[PDB]
Design a binder for these strands. Structure first.
Length: 200
RNA sequence: CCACCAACCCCACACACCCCCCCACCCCCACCCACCACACAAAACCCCCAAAACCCCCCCAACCCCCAAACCCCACCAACCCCACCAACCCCACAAACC
């Protein structure tokens, strides 16, 4: 339900067939034959909106991350809950690692007024970003979340700069990320051009 | 592959004349959350038992050379334009003609 969107399809069926293979092979037993998962998804396409269902996937995902189990492969369904709605923050950490700079050093290269509100929003203290296993990685799936201040849209200026730099460096992930249109993409693309020129 | 007289735009009722228009309108934009057609982990050469590695090898050998006599896919003779009936020739001509 989460991966529902335009032009997917063959990708969604491939994920479904892979999911069926995991669960029809040991330690799992074949109970649904083939293509049943796709037909139930067609009737359960928006089931991701339902809060308790999302809450339960987040719960299972947290347990399987810390504790190895025989049926830990159930996590294939729940992997998406991890760091949900925090693409802005995750994009920032990867940008740091790809560029080979420290978080601080990178923000020095962010030469624009718009970034300030966003940098303050995403680095707000009190959130266990550094802790390896914490409620933070699944906070969006579980309660106490609201709208995530780490979503690509909330940190749009920074997100666009990161990925314009990535496109300059040819990273396929950035080429396929969806640009935040509201957050001044043209100016960001220019700054991204200079930064990418420096780092490529 | 000119020609019926005559007329000689495959012009022309009037009104007309964007294959414009009801209004509000006017991204084939927009629920939210989102936003790599990323992702279980472990891990990632569609690498790997060893012993090995010319899709090399019995030997004799090694022109898909050889009976011999031979060797133009030459030769009876007469010949030798895939010339020739003569009359002779524009696949010219009744006359009147000849977009």
């Amino acid at each position: 339900s989460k991966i529902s969107g335009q032009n997917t399809g063959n990708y969604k069926t491939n994920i479904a067939d892979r999911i069926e293979q995991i669960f029809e092979t040991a330690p799992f037993v074949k109970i649904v034959e083939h293509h049943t998962l796709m037909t139930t998804h067609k009737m359960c396409a928006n089931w991701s909106t339902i809060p308790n269902f999302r809450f339960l996937a987040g719960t299972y995902d947290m347990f399987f991350s810390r504790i190895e189990h025989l049926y830990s492969a159930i996590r294939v369904g729940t992997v998406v809950t991890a760091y949900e709605d925090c693409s802005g923050l995750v994009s920032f950490t990867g940008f740091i690692k790809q560029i080979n700079l420290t978080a601080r050093e990178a923000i020095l290269y962010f030469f624009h007024k718009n970034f300030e509100e966003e940098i303050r929003r995403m680095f707000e203290p009190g959130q266990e970003t550094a802790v390896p296993h914490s409620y933070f990685i699944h906070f969006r799936s579980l309660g106490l979340s609201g709208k995530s201040p780490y979503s690509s849209n909330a940190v749009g200026h920074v997100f666009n700069l990161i990925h314009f730099v990535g496109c300059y460096m040819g990273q396929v992930r950035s080429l396929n990320a969806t640009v935040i249109a509201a957050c001044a993409p043209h100016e960001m693309s220019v700054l991204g051009g200079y930064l990418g020129e420096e780092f490529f």
